[PDB]
């Protein structure tokens, strides 16, 4: 009764955490590149810094499919048809990749990010049944997708391998590689329709292409960036024959929520979520609205604890405009960068739950407290406390030599709070309507 005691049971383990992150696809990287130098550095710091930012540990890039950079389109490394799929692809590398190469180089070389996930939303138009990287259509040569122009399946595998090679030659290792996005959805923008059976057919072609290549690191193939857990779970049966040839399951949080554990041997990443419809809000908590930082801290909780996610990526990091599609507002007029409390929600996770952490059991939670715990590779134990009540006296212990704690709330952005430590037990005052992380350090 001297506070509520949370007890971590290290002997009960769950999934590994690969990390937390976002994207700068569809020219959002270009928006960041336009800022003055101080704004560029502030945007990169708030995304990736483990000292003064969210410490995001994963970057997701788009493999551009478009003929040019009209609108927000991502130009392809091979934007012009070679006529026949038997002819060498025509590579036209611009040394930029829609400004994503720069963001990647900063993430890796400046901030120590080690996980780079490159995903194509479509093949180039000349490889597809409709001849266009937009408006759906399918990769020519897959079962049920004949094209007058012939079979482009091996050409698409060669093209994806070459994109990874261009990154390698620019000193960035792509670690994970996707070849579809929302394969169940036709849209006005870059989109491509594959069945689950077609995804397995293509993995059988892509895997040996990667393995035979001159790539120094062979990236892990991912599938399939469906728009929700329910749609992705429907694809896993057909994928199971190629489980030896890919190593990551990906899905978003749009058409359904990440609320159950999918039946796959692979780690599962939630690779895109956002309040796409909402006008810009910056607040941590007011009433649990769809754009509030509090809401997003709880969305991450749900994906990890209920959805068995090993990673969580918000859709976009920094971009211009007054929607909640992003975490960090760019004001091009002012040359300024202003994080929302959605950035700090994701960072309140990512700063303390580092890649390779193992989720472990913690008991003592309640109506007012939701808790989760993570054992980092360095032996630190991060205990997440999401508090929907008033200030709460909490003790945190293992069933350690020191402790620290940080909170995010309406007044704090991952700000240190007192963690009073005696004989292995941390005592904190978890602020009202906060997400607090208490970290127990080993001797
Ligand atoms: C939440 O999400 C996580 C993923 O993030 C899910 O974790 C996965 O859980 C499954 C089920 O427990 C794990 O599968 C098991 O893996 C073990 C370990 O295999 C490795 O080490 C073995 C030595 O200890 C070794 O023999 C294995 O080698 C084989 O497998 C590799 C890989 O396929 C292959 O290359 C080799 O040639 C071998 O064939 C491997 O290196 C494995 O031992 C399990 O199988 C045995 O035991 C089961 C009974 O538990 C039995 O039924 C089998 O017949 C067999 O005897 C099994 O495959 C998987 O590794 C986890 N994935 C990750 C990434 O951690 C988790 O399940 C999700 N939770 C929920 C609630 O859904
Ligand atoms: C790999 O590199 C060698 C030597 O440069 C080259 O001859 C070969 O064609 C390359 N293979 C591919 C698939 O790029």
Work out the angle between the directed axes of helices 153-169 and 196-212 (0-180°, nearest 10).
Answer: 50
Give the separation between CA 17 and CA 372, rounded to whole angstroms.
Answer: 12
Which string of b and e fits 363-400 if b means at least 16 CB within 10 Å? ebeeeebbbbbbbbeeebbbbbbbbbeeebebbbbbeb
CA 5 to chain centre: 33
- C-alpha dihedral, 60 to 66 to 68 to 74, nearest 10°: -10
Q: Would the CA dihedral through 124, 127, 131, 133 be positive or negative?
A: negative
347 conformational bin, left if phi > 0, alpha if psi -120 to 50, beta if neither? alpha
Experimental method: X-ray
**CA atoms of 110 and 15, how far apart (whole Å):** 29
CA–CA gap between residue 335 and residue 106 (Å, rounded): 20
Around 212, how many Cα atoms within 13 Å sit in the side-chain half-sphere?
Answer: 9
Ligand at minimal distance from the CA of 169 is: 2
Instruction: State how far Cα 345 lies from the chain centre.
Output: 14
The residue to mutate among 214, 215, 218, having the most atoms of ligand 2 within 8 angstroms of its beta carbon, is: 214
Beta bridge partners of 331: 336
Q: What is the CATH number of domain 19-355?
A: 3.20.20.80
Ligand 1 centroid from CA 55, angstroms: 30
Whether the CB-CB separation of 153 and 206 falls below 8 Å is answered with no
Q: Ligand 1: which of 236, 265, 361 to mutate, judged by most atoms within 8 Å of the beta carbon?
A: 265
Give, in degrees to the nearest 5, the angle at Cα 215 between 23 and 163: 40
Write out the chain in H/E/C secondary structure.
CCCEEEEEEEEEEEEEECEEEEECCCCHHHHHHHCCHHHHHHHHHHHHCCCCCCCCCEEEEECCCECCCCCCCCECCCCCCCCCCCCCCCCCCCCCCCCHHHHHHHHHHHHCCCEEEEECCCCCHHHECCCCCECCCCECCCCCCCCCCCCCHHHHHHHHHHHHHHHHHCCCCCCEEECCCCCCCCCCCECCCCCHHHHHHHHHHHHHHHHHCCCCCCCEEEEEEECCHHHHHHHHHHHHHHCCCCCEEEEECCCCCCCCCCCCCCCEEEEECCEEEEECCCCCCCCCCCCCHHHHHHHHHHHHHCCCCCEEEEEEEEEECCEECEEEEEECCCCEEEECHHHHHHHHHHCCCCCCEEEEEEECCCCCEEEEEEECCCCCEEEEEEECCCCEEEEEEECCCEEEEEEECCCCCCEEECCEEECCEEEEEECCCEEEEEEEECC
What is the location of CATH 2.60.40.1180 in the chain? 4-11+360-441
Whole-number Å distance between alpha carbons of 340 and 290:
13
Q: Any idea which fold 4-11+360-441 has?
A: Immunoglobulin-like (2.60.40)
Nearest atom in ligand 1 to the alpha carbon of residue 243 is 33
**Spatial separation of the C-alpha atoms in residues 138 and 145, rounded to whole Å:** 6
Give the number of whichever ligand sits closest to the CA of residue 210. Answer: 2
214 lines ligand 2 (CB under 6 A): yes
Which value in Å is the resolution of this experimental model?
Answer: 1.4
Q: Distance between CA atoms of 62 and 98, rounded to whole angstroms?
A: 9
The CATH 3.20.20.80 domain(s) of the chain lie at 19-355
* 345-to-17, 18, 99, 165, 328 alpha-carbon distances in Å: 17, 17, 26, 35, 12
Q: How far is CA 82 from CA 90, 96, 146, 416, in A?
A: 6, 22, 18, 57
Q: Are 22 and 60 in contact (CB under 8 A)?
A: yes
CA–CA distance, 343 with 328 (Å, rounded to integer): 7
How far is it, in rounded angstroms, from Cα 208 to Cα 204? Answer: 7
**What does the alpha-carbon distance between residue 10 and residue 362 come to, in Å, rounded to a whole number?**
8
Distance 265 CA to ligand 1 centre (A): 7
Select from 344, 351, 354 the least CA-distant residue to 413.
Answer: 344
Residue labelled with tokens 């057919």: 201
CB 424 within 8 A of CB 399: no
Altogether, the residues listed in the chain come to a count of 443
Q: Are 407 and 430 in contact (CB under 8 A)?
A: yes
Establish whether residue 213 lines the binding site of ligand 2, counting it when its CB lies within 6 angstroms of any ligand atom.
Answer: yes
Yes or no: say if 307 and 359 are a contact pair by the CB < 8 Å rule: no
């Amino acid at each position: 009764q001297a506070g509520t005691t949370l007890t971590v049971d290290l002997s009960t383990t769950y999934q590994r955490i690969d990390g937390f992150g976002t994207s700068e696809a569809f020219q959002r990287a270009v928006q960041m590149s336009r800022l003055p130098e101080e704004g560029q550095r502030r945007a990169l710091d708030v995304l990736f810094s483990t000292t003064n930012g969210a410490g995001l540990s994963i970057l997701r890039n788009g493999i551009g499919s478009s003929p040019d950079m009209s609108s927000d389109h991502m130009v392809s490394i091979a934007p012009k048809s070679p006529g026949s799929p038997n002819n060498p692809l025509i590579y036209s590398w611009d040394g930029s990749d829609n400004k994503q190469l720069w963001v990647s180089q900063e993430a890796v070389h400046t901030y120590g990010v080690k996980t780079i996930y490159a995903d194509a939303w479509s093949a180039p138009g000349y490889m597809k049944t409709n001849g266009n990287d937009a408006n759906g259509g399918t990769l020519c040569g897959l079962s049920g997708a004949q094209c007058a122009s012939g079979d482009w399946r091996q050409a698409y595998a060669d093209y994806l391998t070459k994109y990874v090679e261009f990154y390698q030659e620019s000193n960035v290792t792509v670690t994970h590689l996707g070849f579809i996005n929302a394969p169940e959805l036709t849209t006005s923008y870059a989109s491509m329709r594959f069945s689950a059976s077609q995804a397995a057919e293509f993995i059988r072609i892509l895997y040996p292409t990667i393995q035979k290549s001159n790539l120094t690191y062979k990236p892990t193939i991912a599938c399939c960036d469906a728009e929700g857990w329910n749609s992705q779970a429907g694809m896993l049966g057909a994928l199971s024959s190629v489980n030896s040839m890919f190593g990551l399951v990906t899905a978003h949080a749009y058409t359904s929520q990440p609320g159950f554990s999918m039946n796959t041997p692979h780690p599962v990443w939630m690779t895109a979520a956002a309040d796409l419809q909402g006008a810009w809000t910056s607040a941590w908590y007011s009433y649990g609205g769809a754009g509030e930082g509090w809401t997003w801290a709880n969305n991450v909780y749900n994906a990890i604890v209920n959805g068995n996610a090993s990673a969580y990526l918000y859709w976009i990091g920094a971009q211009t405009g007054n929607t909640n599609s992003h975490m960090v507002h760019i004001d091009a007029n002012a040359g300024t960068v202003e994080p929302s409390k959605r950035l700090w929600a994701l960072g309140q996770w990512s700063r303390f739950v580092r890649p390779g952490a193992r989720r472990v059991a913690v008991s003592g939670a309640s109506g007012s407290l939701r808790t989760a715990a993570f054992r980092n590779e360095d032996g630190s134990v991060a205990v997440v406390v999401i508090n929907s009540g008033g200030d709460a006296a909490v003790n945190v212990r293992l069933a350690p030599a020191s402790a620290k704690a940080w909170a995010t709330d309406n007044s704090r952005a991952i700000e240190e709070i007192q963690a009073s430590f005696a004989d292995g037990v941390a005592t904190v005052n978890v602020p009202s309507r906060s997400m607090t992380t208490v970290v127990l350090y080993p001797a």
